[PDB]
Amino acid sequence: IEDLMFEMSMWRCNDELRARADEVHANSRKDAAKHYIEFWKSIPTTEPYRVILGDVRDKLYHTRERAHQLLSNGHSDVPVEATFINLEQFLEPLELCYRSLCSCGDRPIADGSLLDFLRQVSTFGLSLVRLDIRQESDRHTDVLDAITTHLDIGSYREWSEERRQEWLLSELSGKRPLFGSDLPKTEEIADVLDTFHVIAELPADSFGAYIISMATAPSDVLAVELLQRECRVKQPLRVVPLFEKLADLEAAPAAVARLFSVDWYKNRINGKQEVMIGYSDSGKDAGRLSAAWQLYKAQEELVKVAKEYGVKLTMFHGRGGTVGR
Amino acid sequence: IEDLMFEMSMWRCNDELRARADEVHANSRKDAAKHYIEFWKSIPTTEPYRVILGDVRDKLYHTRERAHQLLSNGHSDVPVEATFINLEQFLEPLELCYRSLCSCGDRPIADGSLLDFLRQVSTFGLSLVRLDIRQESDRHTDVLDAITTHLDIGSYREWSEERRQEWLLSELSGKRPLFGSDLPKTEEIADVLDTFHVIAELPADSFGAYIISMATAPSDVLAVELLQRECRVKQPLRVVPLFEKLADLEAAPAAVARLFSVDWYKNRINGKQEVMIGYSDSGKDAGRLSAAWQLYKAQEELVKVAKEYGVKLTMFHGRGGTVGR
């Protein structure tokens, strides 16, 4: 950010950027500001881009310090409002600099370090990569079984698919909490519940998708939607089934269609569903030719199903490095 | 405590107090300890009572500083293990000093300032008075009605007594949480719920009884027991109905008997029950003579009920200063 400040030394801007740079210079904090090496003096409004990017430097400094304390210790005293919390609170001032430079005839200047910086922000964001969470369906089934047994309502394991679907729908549409603080948990159950709590405690743009290994029924996905909602996950991450074994690739389209059949889930899915397609295990239990061909057919009929439900299906190909996977 | 330390200057003790004083002198913290005025030097084992009471002084200093910060600010850094948390963590060292003095023939000395201090602790405890909470039943009814309507199960107001008793009982014996973070609350509803949370946050020996104004049915008591358990009140305080209007005193024994008839409540009440008997409003709507006489009848038949259920009844007389109340 400092080198970007060094280049943005023009003196022409729009009235928009003019107004904003005057705003920053109003609350400019007339201080020594000796913690920086360069630009430690209050940046004059003569170079408005430097004023603005100087503020961008301030919020980067405090975001970095906060993330650093949050990581090193368990907490930070840096106010959140002093940092960049949004994926594009960061993006907004740079967008302003770009609009300004283009209006004043400096689109070439805008298409340099500022454009690289725009792209780096909109590609890496506040967290270099969005993180995916993966877990085998059986662990979620263990959780729900614990919850139904402790609620003395039956055993979710022994329940059929139909019954699991009816109960899951009633709780997903219901408004009363499920389990409580006193739910008896195993280290496995506590592992999955705590991963949901960590997902709730951390920023939403820091996570990607929740992948269910050994997924076979709609109950497996709806179980994850329920565990997310129930673990107070503010912005719940998208659920994605993983079909890797030849049996599961064969039966993937039927299961996915059965899931889209649940109107409650298709209405919350927002026209987009991602399903993963593993490549390693198919050619291990069956032939490699048979596995490849079955993968092709699987992709083909998953697309057919999604088209039949008006859902944009994007498939996540679990390809390896070696031809065998 | 400092003057008590100055007086207990004997050198004879039991093997018991000898062992304990030696324990304190092990973790004696050979330091300056200059925050005190007197006895800032490490107390020698020559005077063992001074050792033990010196530790009592340390935990008192940290108790005082902690409560002072807790009151002044919203928090304190003073460790809880450094303070007196129990009603008789405080009493244990003083009890030991008393046993010591009696064993060594110093029962006159023990029956002096140490006995005064013992009685002061065992009478005033860590918080001079236990605080009662009082609230009119209709506010609890408003809360529960909000809870049933938001849960889409009916309206607790409109429900008959029988139904309220069955529902409250099922929730008291059940293990699933009731309301959640997202329960729509009024300033009144939030007032009472927040009073329960405040009761949960504070030490149990700081509170007395939860008195219900305008109490008429067991559902009014059970509503308080439920709201307490549901607001995560670690050690729920006793519930006590307040019968002050003549109509309520006339029907009080029947109502208390109906409450004792609920086995779930009679098993948790632990053979002891407190019920309040108001004097102010009785002589206001009816005659003073009729009110007094009905009060006598009330006490008499409440005792009959308690004896009938094997419960030690203690009655709470809301007497005034003027004969009219």
Q: Where are the alpha helices (DSSP H) in B125-202?
A: 137-150, 161-173, 187-201
Q: Which two tokens stand for residue B173?
A: 């014996």
Q: Quick check: A177 and B180 CB within 8 A?
A: yes
User: In this structure, are residues B118 and B98 in contact, taking their beta carbons and an 8 Å threshold?
Assistant: yes
List CB contacts (< 8 A) between B149 and chain A.
none
Q: Quick check: A180 and B175 CB within 8 A?
A: yes
| DSSP conformation class of B262 | -
User: In this structure, are residues B255 and B295 in contact, taking their beta carbons and an 8 Å threshold?
Assistant: no
- Bridge partners (DSSP) of residue A274 are A314
Rounded to the nearest 5°, which phi and psi values hold at A313? -90, 125
Q: Where are the alpha helices (DSSP H) in chain B?
A: 2-7, 15-26, 48-72, 91-103, 107-109, 115-124, 137-150, 161-173, 187-201, 218-230, 246-250, 252-261, 263-268, 282-285, 288-309
For A230, nearest residue in chain B (alpha carbons) = B180
A54, exposed or middle or buried, with CB in 10 Å at 0-12, 13-18, 19+?
A: buried
Q: Quick check: B182 and A176 CB within 8 A?
A: no
Give the residue from B147, B149, B176 with the most A CB atoms within 10 Å of its CB, the best one to mutate. Answer: B176
Chains A and B form CB pairs within 8 A to the count of: 30
Report the distance separating Cα B41 and Cα B32, nearest Å. Answer: 7
CB nearest to B151's CB, from A176, A178, A182: A176
Angle formed by the axes of helices B137-150 and B187-201, nearest 10°: 100
List active site positions of B.
284
List active site positions of A.
284
Interface list for chain B against chain A, based on CB atoms closer than 8 Å: 150-152, 175-182, 232
Q: Quick check: A175 and B180 CB within 8 A?
A: yes
Torsion of CA A23, A29, A30, A35, to 10 degrees: -130
User: In this structure, are residues B104 and B14 in contact, taking their beta carbons and an 8 Å threshold?
Assistant: yes
Report the distance separating Cα B212 and Cα B230, nearest Å. Answer: 18
List CB contacts (< 8 A) between B177 and chain A.
176-180
Query: Given CA atoms A146, A151, A152, A158 in this order, what sign does their dihedral have?
Result: negative
User: In this structure, are residues B114 and B101 in contact, taking their beta carbons and an 8 Å threshold?
Assistant: yes
Report the distance separating Cα B49 and Cα B18, nearest Å. Answer: 9
For B179, nearest residue in chain A (alpha carbons) = A176
Q: Quick check: B177 and A182 CB within 8 A?
A: no
List CB contacts (< 8 A) between B178 and chain A.
176-177
Reduced to 3 states, what is the DSSP secondary structure of residue A315?
Answer: strand
Tokens 């006995």 belong to which residue? B115
List CB contacts (< 8 A) between A180 and chain B.
175-177
Tokens 């889209």 belong to which residue? A260
List CB contacts (< 8 A) between A181 and chain B.
232
